[PDB]
Design a protein around this ligand. Structure first.
Ligand SMILES: Nc1ncnc2c1ncn2[C@@H]1O[C@H](COP(=O)(O)OP(=O)(O)OP(=O)(O)O)[C@@H](O)[C@H]1O
Ligand code: NA
Ligand code: NA
Ligand SMILES: [Zn+2]
Lengths: 259, 604
């Protein structure tokens, strides 16, 4: 896929998608906005997973226990909003970090870069936007670079395992049941149990140009939310998977993990 | 009680809480949101009471809840009733068989209840000119689009566990991941109630999360102005301008925010009770009894001049809006003209004699850290105590000093005028302390609070976010907690934060220092505070004590030597009660604090 970073000098996905959508003088679009990432001097960053809680100058990754045959999370301290490096998250997704020093968590738009991942079905976005450019953000201006290289997170070889988690990089729009159900199908597998660790539903609304009024309100699982799953049988957990509504708008980017 | 078949632990949780309250443009909305929420628990609690009665509700202790008195026993209660004393979590002991029925019923009981309010709200809105439309159109307001919003908005989650079950602590402790904490409860060699509860939460949190995401999509159209999230009623039908027209005050309203506007009147009909202050300005003006005195001295006249300006400006010899007290309101933002000058000038003259009007008020949030004191009966006594503290102790403190909105036990939400903020928080803290007879020096029960001082023009939702931030993010991140976090947000946008121990209120009050600042005019050295803060930008080479000593001298004849001793002495005392990892952090905190309580614009 094309990899589009902006240098700036939710409706985040919508804004980005529209922007691209909008750039092309020359309702989802034809192309698909897989997802987006926030950027800083430290590169890409992601909302801190909801199962990582601060304590003792440290953030503890807490894993589920199966109570009454039911997946659950041990009673712990409140979630503290934050961000983590792409480096840290990958460790997380492999269940290979037991904790992160507090200093590392990134409380710090107030933003330096925004990354766009796009599947261009011969819309010729790469060559056209490829021209080194400064483009109008949907007002503010940005510098645009485009690379044909897909991000490392996207290509990872997770093991094949019965226990997988899905971390939502972007707001995913769906009821829990539909999502797991949609999941079961795409992986063509059956899920014995699942636990969703998340904050209260996010209200996402966007403009309808033709109707010329605000779009119907939808409720999305907030980013950083994690879905733990116990499959009936061994499944090759994908590096990432798109779920829920408004996919081509950058929604429903869930990154694969294990536990 | 305690004798039953298949006793089961049942837990109830209601959401959303803070997000709901935050969606308030006015104090009245804020109050309604808090009150309504408690009511929902009550409805939910009714089911258990009907089925088993109060004593089977461990938390909260029902026996004295006014709601309980005035809705289950029809006792007469008075303005006591306005305060929301019911939290959004509860647990009872009940039979296993009837439990699932309880789950269905509560969900339904609240669901039906919300639906009523919407409908009574609909009639109300259309009649009194809130919605301004041909009653023919009324049928439109009851369509599924709007009904669904009301049904779906709140998730009340019910969960339960068998109190009689085959038990292995090895296995039970195992599924929940909590090691190195076994001896106190791993050790049972002579039922696991305390551990049992915590799992319930873990279990409860699983259900609430699923159930709160089962949320239907909405139709296109303009959103409620207050909440900004749900389609404004008639939102689908009209263009924005015309739609703005159907609504009084130009505020289109979704269902869940419409119920908010109606809710106040509904309690009144039910209880003939209303809160004294519908506005923050109403609470702001309490400061120095400034309003009492002014309305009385000039208040009498003020309307006719104002009345002379507009017929619709006021009713009943009373101003419609309290912000009319501020000349600035006249000066600009009004929404025939000669009168303006004399009033403005009239009011400015008024300020001359009495002093300027307070435009600042305080939000007080307090929470109990960290609950509880980890036997079902032991739990009950604690609950009864918490209920007693909340219902009576807190009420007596806030009584007549401002607006007490919510007291769920450990937790509190109050709106106070600046002059009584510190006074009240400390008092509550003490009462809380005595009520558990905790003896210092080394207490817990501990309690933390957040005090946000905001300009009246400041958006309510934001004030609430910040105030909660102070409590959770500042006060409770302090090791040992039991802290008070004060934030002064100024219309300029300048935000000042000070974290302090509780006794600091005590020490500073009754300090000569306070007196000099209070007896500041004729004043104490100006820039005293700026100068000290400047030296704490970095470690004074001289050292902290010297600089203090130094600065104390620069600002303050035989007595002058005696006075500086005291001030320097008093300052040294306070720093003991200012949070901060280092002496430098403490000095800023103390002097930042001084900066706060001494701001002329905040404390005329
Ligand atoms: N009716 C009410 N009016 C005002 N405030 C309330 C009301 N009910 C609860 N609160 C306060 O708001 C808080 C919101 O609780 P929340 O929904 O976050 O669940 P919680 O598990 O208590 O969360 P946390 O403990 O992490 O704050 C409660 O702890 C309570 O103290
Ligand atoms: Na909360
Ligand atoms: Na608490
Ligand atoms: Zn609304």
């Amino acid at each position: 896929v094309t990899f589009t970073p902006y240098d700036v000098l939710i409706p985040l996905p919508q804004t980005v998608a529209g922007a691209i959508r909008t750039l092309l003088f020359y309702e989802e679009p034809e192309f698909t906005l897989v997802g987006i990432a926030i950027g800083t001097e430290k590169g890409r960053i992601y909302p801190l997973p909801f199962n990582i809680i601060k304590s003792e100058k440290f953030y503890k990754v807490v894993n589920p226990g199966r109570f009454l045959g039911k997946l659950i999370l041990p009673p712990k301290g409140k979630y503290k909003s934050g961000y983590v490096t792409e480096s840290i998250l990958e460790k997380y997704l492999k269940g290979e970090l037991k904790e992160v020093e507090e200093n590392k968590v990134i409380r710090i738009l107030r933003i330096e870069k925004i990354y766009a991942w796009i599947e261009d079905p011969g819309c010729g976005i790469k060559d056209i936007l490829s021209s080194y450019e400064f483009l109008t953000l949907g007002s503010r201006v940005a510098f645009v670079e485009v690379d044909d290289k897909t991000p490392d997170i996207f290509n990872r070889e997770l093991g094949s395992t019965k226990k997988a988690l899905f971390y939502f990089s972007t707001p995913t729009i769906g009821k829990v049941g539909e999502i797991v159900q949609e999941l079961e199908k795409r992986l063509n597998a059956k899920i014995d149990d699942y636990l969703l660790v998340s904050s209260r539903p996010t209200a996402i609304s966007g403009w309808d140009m033709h109707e010329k009024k605000p779009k119907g309100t939808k409720f999305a699982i907030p980013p950083g939310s994690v879905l733990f799953v116990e499959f009936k049988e061994e499944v090759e957990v994908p590096p990432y998977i798109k779920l829920g509504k408004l996919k081509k708008l950058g929604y429903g980017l869930a990154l694969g993990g294990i536990w | 009680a305690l004798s039953v078949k298949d006793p089961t632990l049942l837990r109830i949780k209601i959401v959303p809480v803070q997000p709901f309250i935050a969606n308030s443009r006015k104090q009245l909305d804020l109050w309604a949101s808090s009150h309504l929420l408690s009511m929902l628990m009550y409805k939910a609690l009714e089911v258990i009471v009907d089925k088993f009665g109060p004593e089977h509700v461990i938390y909260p202790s029902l026996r004295d809840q006014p709601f309980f008195l005035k809705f289950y026993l029809g006792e007469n209660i008075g303005d006591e009733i306005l305060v929301a004393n019911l939290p959004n979590k509860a647990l009872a002991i009940v039979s296993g068989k009837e439990a699932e029925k309880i789950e269905e019923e509560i969900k339904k009981r609240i669901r039906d209840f919300l639906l009523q309010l919407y409908r009574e709200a609909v009639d109300w809105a259309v009649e009194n000119g809130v919605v301004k439309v041909d009653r023919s159109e009324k049928d439109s307001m009851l369509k599924e689009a709007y009904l669904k919003i009301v049904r779906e908005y709140f998730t009340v989650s019910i969960t339960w566990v068998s109190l009689s079950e085959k038990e292995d602590i090895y296995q039970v402790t195992e599924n929940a991941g909590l090691s190195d904490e076994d001896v106190k409860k791993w050790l049972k060699f002579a039922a696991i109630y305390p551990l049992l509860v915590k799992i319930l939460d873990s279990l409860g949190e699983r259900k609430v999360t699923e159930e709160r995401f089962e949320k239907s999509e909405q139709l296109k159209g303009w959103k409620c102005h207050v909440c900004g999230e749900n389609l404004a009623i008639f939102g689908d039908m009209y263009d924005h301008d015309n739609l703005k027209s159907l609504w009084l005050d130009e505020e289109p309203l979704c269902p869940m925010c419409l119920i908010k506007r109606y809710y106040p009147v509904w309690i009144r009909s039910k209880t003939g009770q209303k809160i004294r202050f519908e506005s923050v300005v109403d609470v702001a003006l309490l400061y120095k009894n400034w309003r009492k005195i002014f309305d009385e001295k000039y208040g009498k006249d003020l309307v006719s001049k104002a009345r002379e300006v507009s017929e619709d400006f006021v009713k009943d010899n009373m101003l419609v809006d309290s912000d009319l007290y501020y000349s600035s309101t006249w000066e600009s933002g009004l929404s025939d003209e000669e009168k303006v000058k004399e009033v403005v000038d009239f009011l400015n003259a008024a300020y001359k004699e009495i002093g300027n009007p307070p435009k600042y008020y305080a939000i007080l949030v307090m929470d109990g850290d960290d609950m509880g004191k980890v036997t079902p009966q032991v739990h009950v006594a604690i609950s009864q105590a918490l209920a007693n503290f909340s219902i009576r102790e807190v009420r007596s403190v806030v009584k007549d000093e401002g607006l007490l909105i919510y007291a769920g036990g450990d937790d509190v939400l109050a709106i106070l005028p600046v002059d009584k903020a510190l006074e009240v928080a400390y008092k509550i803290r003490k009462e809380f302390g005595k009520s558990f007879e905790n003896g210092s020096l080394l207490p817990g029960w501990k309690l933390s609070a957040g005090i946000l001082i905001v300009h009246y023009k400041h958006p309510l939702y934001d004030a609430l976010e910040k105030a909660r931030d102070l409590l959770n993010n500042k006060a409770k991140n302090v090791p040992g907690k039991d802290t008070l976090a004060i934030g002064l947000l100024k219309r300029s946008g300048s935000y000042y934060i000070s974290l302090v121990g509780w006794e600091l209120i005590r020490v500073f009050y009754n300090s000569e220092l306070r007196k000099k600042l209070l007896e500041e005019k004729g004043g104490v050295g100006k820039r005293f505070i700026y100068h000290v803060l400047r030296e704490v930008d970095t470690w004074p080479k001289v050292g902290i004590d010297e600089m203090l000593k130094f600065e104390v001298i620069r600002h303050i004849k035989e007595e002058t030597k005696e006075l500086r001793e005291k001030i320097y002495g008093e300052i040294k005392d306070l720093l003991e009660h200012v949070r901060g990892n280092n002496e430098v952090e403490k000095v800023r905190g103390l002097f930042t604090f001084l900066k706060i309580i001494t701001d002329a614009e905040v404390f005329p």
